[PDB]
């Protein structure tokens, strides 16, 4: 039962783990909701809602 | 002349400027045109203030004491988009750098560190007349003790030309914060001002002081001195009737 | 208690509240028609792990009784590493 | 047995002497309580000292209230050993502070009933006061 | 042969040259392009900014049109550059010239996505601009990269190439690359023994020889570098300031950022259009007040006008050229880990004075700066690219003893670029 050995996490990694580029969805309004909004607007036009 | 039936001005301030210039004595990179300010001292025969009125006196002056390059933060009652649009419409962006709504000022700047950061970002803090009373809180002693007191700019109707007029008047006027005391110091300008300009500033300030600060004006005035942040308080004028005025008042 | 006081200011909108907001926008689009980014707490194990690895998390709150403990047994060390 | 002195720092505004005694007396009796205040205005200096009848009680309070997240502040509770606890450190404990309105007294001192002799003792040699400045010129 | 129209070039090159705004040829262009159009091996020596870029690009592109190269033919032209920043400068010009063409252009450099560059190469890149280190790596390991049809080879500033330490890589590259029927070019600022040695192994026998031939520093930490700069620029807004940087991506980001925080600046980046850059530089010269951003390589060859302040925001990639470049006020931003540059300057016999600043006056808009960078997609993408190019330029510095990337602190550098944490940029 040796004491916990932090041979790896004893230091802080300064950079994020991923180097992938940031997409533009995270800076623009949501497209799922805009799709949902247009579907709701359709149902309001047709009297379903 | 309003002082004691005489105006011992001109010569006194020219001498002060000559003293200020003559006692001149790495290299630094963040330089400014900052010069020693001109401080007019004034002693009264009674405490002109019942309590510190944390609202400055817009003493209109013809030689502005605030440098024209000073950035202004405008504190307005919410909404904030309205007066941001008005400032952009009137072309005050180089002058009114930032417009802050009152609630946004109450929320986003709550820490003293945040209050200090905001305070040092700007040189003058203009504030809408109908939100001045709120500002003693939300700002505290970080502003009202560290020489950053909001100025009451009157923009109630809120149109481009009044905003420009109020701002230029705001820069053109000096400010004094009335506090309970017999002696108080008022800024007349900086050494860069000429002897005539400072004297014009002195007489205009004394005219405002006699009416709105000292209830009995010159009769209430005891003595006047001219000074900078370091120099001697050069006596501009002393009361010629104070011998009988003190006896009459103190009885 | 203080942590949950901050958390409760950033609860995600309920499905009913989300529906109400989206219908409100749908009516404007239908009749006559710019928004700010939402603010809420982040949840889901995979999503939070990606946020820690991206160094975007400001505060991680790990449940103390996750039954398969392997799900979060690595989390404190990962948070320590990041 | 041994009187334990406990320092509390980073007190949230409003956690003053009445609040400290009412709260800390729960852990056990509180002998002397003094929270530092400024001379001129009497405003809180945001730290205080408490005496507990037993050093063990002060140890329990120190271990339970240190780093207490209270109104956005972590409460710093640490027991001061008696060898740097000074006998005068409790001077003025349990006694309400007197906010002397020095501005008000000076105002009355400025404008109070006065007689001819005191006026003469006021004017003195103001000419010399002017003359001293003239020599400085 | 006075104008570009004198040469018997194709219309597509003529339209491209006209768009870039080149009408009168330089002396090196007059002495090089005509013999190069005939496929004559040339050893050229020229100074800084004489116009070597257009000197070797025009004949080799005209050659590319004449042979009607296609992507499946692989690489027909290889242009070797000592550094990434010059390679990117050459690549940008080649894009402008090949605008009205069909031959493909590509660049393989150091510190870039090698896995992405290999995908580019297998598709077929007719005109390849490369660095010796990365070019040798692709010539050895990249399967599918076709260069057996190589007909043209150009070496730019070989004297600098050898100085960086590419002696082994250059000779390895020559051994791998085919030599028969390959028009070879060697341009150099100086003629050292290594240059003549590289000429003899690379150039065909009997090559045609063409020859046309007080400092101030601030010790500022990496995280406070931008804040001190922005405060200084605001202070001297009513003057003529020119700032030098180590990357075009760095220049683009600062120009975009300063215009976003409402500090009107000019840059020699534009949209990487040569005519726009000349117009912007002309605008800066005309106006008595204004501030212009650019790189050291872009400045090299451009006549610096009367400027109140010349600022070296990023270290100089060619310290030997920088010390003679000086011969208003000159300022250079430096870090405590880079204080060895003072010793090197003293060895170079240049007088230097020190500029200090108070921490009070430095604008503390860091929290706002990182707010806007995170809130804006294009600001963030520019910030990441400017930050990545800064470190890549820092890794490739010649003065490894003075400008050590390892001694550099990555967290502080990113803080200058508008980051709470460093982005994951791979070297």
Curated annotation (Swiss-Prot), chain B:
Localization, per the record, is: Nucleus, Nucleolus
GO terms for biological process, alphabetical: assembly of large subunit precursor of preribosome; maturation of SSU-rRNA
Record's keyword terms, sorted:
Nucleus, Ribosome biogenesis, rRNA processing
Any GO CC annotation of this UniProt entry: preribosome
Q: Which GO terms describe its molecular function?
A: RNA binding
**Quaternary context:** Component of the 90S pre-ribosomes.
* Sequence similarity: Belongs to the universal ribosomal protein uL1 family. Highly divergent.
The entry's function note states: Involved in rRNA-processing and ribosome biosynthesis.
Name the record gives this protein: Putative ribosome biogenesis protein C8F11.04
Q: What is the lineage of its organism?
A: Eukaryota, Fungi, Dikarya, Ascomycota, Taphrinomycotina
Full-protein residues shown here are: 5 to 266 of 373
From Swiss-Prot, chain C:
| GO (cellular component) term, any one | cytosolic large ribosomal subunit
Q: Does the keyword Ribonucleoprotein apply?
A: yes
Which Gene Ontology BP annotations are present?
cytoplasmic translation; maturation of LSU-rRNA
Q: Keyword Iron-sulfur on this protein? A: no
Q: Which UniProt keywords apply?
A: Cytoplasm, Phosphoprotein, Ribonucleoprotein, Ribosomal protein
Query: Which locations, inside or outside the cell, does it occupy?
Result: Cytoplasm
Q: Which domain of life does this protein belong to? A: Eukaryota
An example molecular function term from Gene Ontology annotations: structural constituent of ribosome
Give a short account of what the protein does. Component of the ribosome, a large ribonucleoprotein complex responsible for the synthesis of proteins in the cell. The small ribosomal subunit (SSU) binds messenger RNAs (mRNAs) and translates the encoded message by selecting cognate aminoacyl-transfer RNA (tRNA) molecules. The large subunit (LSU) contains the ribosomal catalytic site termed the peptidyl transferase center (PTC), which catalyzes the formation of peptide bonds, thereby polymerizing the amino acids delivered by tRNAs into a polypeptide chain.
Family, according to the entry, reads as follows: Belongs to the eukaryotic ribosomal protein eL8 family.
Q: How is this protein organized at the quaternary level?
A: Component of the large ribosomal subunit (LSU). Mature yeast ribosomes consist of a small (40S) and a large (60S) subunit. The 40S small subunit contains 1 molecule of ribosomal RNA (18S rRNA) and at least 33 different proteins. The large 60S subunit contains 3 rRNA molecules (25S, 5.8S and 5S rRNA) and at least 46 different proteins.
This one is known as Large ribosomal subunit protein eL8
Q: What is the species of this protein? A: Schizosaccharomyces pombe (strain 972 / ATCC 24843)
Upper classification of the organism: Eukaryota, Fungi, Dikarya, Ascomycota, Taphrinomycotina
Give the gene that encodes this protein: rpl8
Curated annotation (Swiss-Prot), chain D:
Limits of the RRM domain = 4-82
* Compartments, record wording: Nucleus, Nucleolus
Please state what the protein is called: Uncharacterized RNA-binding protein C1827.05c
Q: Which organism is it from?
A: Schizosaccharomyces pombe (strain 972 / ATCC 24843)
Which residues of the whole protein are included?
102 to 238 of 276
Curated annotation (Swiss-Prot), chain E:
Superkingdom, natural source = Eukaryota
Q: Position of motif Bipartite nuclear localization signal?
A: 224-240
UniProt-annotated binding residues for ATP: 46-53
Q: Where is this motif: DEAD box?
A: 156-159
As its record notes, the protein acts as a catalyst of: ATP + H2O = ADP + phosphate + H(+)
Coiled-coil ranges from the UniProt annotation: none
Keyword Phosphoprotein found: yes
Q: What does UniProt give as the signal peptide span?
A: none
* GO molecular function terms noted in the UniProt entry: ATP binding; ATP hydrolysis activity; RNA binding; RNA helicase activity
Q: The Helicase C-terminal domain covers which part of the protein?
A: 214-373
Give start-end ranges for motif Q motif. 2-30
Which E.C. number(s) belong to this protein?
3.6.4.13
Q: Where located?
A: Nucleus, Nucleolus
Any one Gene Ontology biological process term?
A: assembly of large subunit precursor of preribosome
Domain Helicase ATP-binding: where?
Answer: 33-209
Keyword Chloroplast on this protein?
no
Keywords of this entry: ATP-binding, Helicase, Hydrolase, Nucleotide-binding, Nucleus, Phosphoprotein, Ribosome biogenesis, RNA-binding, rRNA processing
Name the GO cellular-component terms. nucleolus; nucleus; preribosome
Could you give the subunit structure recorded for this chain?
Associates in the nucleolus with the 60S and pre-60S ribosomal subunits.
Explain the purpose of this protein. ATP-dependent RNA helicase involved in 40S ribosomal subunit biogenesis. Required for the processing and cleavage of 35S pre-rRNA at sites A0, A1, and A2, leading to mature 18S rRNA.
Family the entry assigns: Belongs to the DEAD box helicase family. DDX18/HAS1 subfamily.
Present the record's domain note: The Q motif is unique to and characteristic of the DEAD box family of RNA helicases and controls ATP binding and hydrolysis.
Q: What is this protein called?
A: ATP-dependent RNA helicase has1
**Source species taxonomy:** Eukaryota, Fungi, Dikarya, Ascomycota, Taphrinomycotina
